[PDB]
């Protein structure tokens, strides 16, 4: 009948999922460059910069 009796396993699963989600989300940051996608940078300008 009663749920929420297995909080520890759910905590483990949620922590792993959140870590993976933040890791995959970190892929959309400029870090000070002109774009967050590498193909546009490659296709918009020559190597030296």
């Amino acid at each position: 009948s009663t749920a929420s009796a297995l909080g520890k396993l759910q905590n483990v699963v949620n922590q792993n999922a959140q870590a993976l989600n933040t890791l995959v989300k970190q892929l959309s940051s400029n870090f000070g460059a002109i774009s967050s996608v590498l193909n546009d940078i490659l296709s918009r300008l020559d190597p030296p910069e």
Partner: protein, 50 residues
């Protein structure tokens, strides 16, 4: 026009070749910042300003 009244034109709906501008040596300064001058032929824009 004078510098304090710089003349602005908007260009759109055209096919532009920039090689004919690069190869010509009539220009003393041909300085490009955000893009490589040789790649302009492979990019498509909208609402160009001159």
């Amino acid at each position: 026009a004078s510098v304090y009244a710089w003349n602005r034109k908007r260009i759109s709906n055209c096919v532009a070749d920039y090689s004919v501008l690069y190869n010509s040596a009539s220009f003393s300064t041909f300085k490009c910042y955000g893009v490589s001058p040789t790649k302009l032929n492979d990019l498509c824009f909208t609402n160009v300003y001159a």
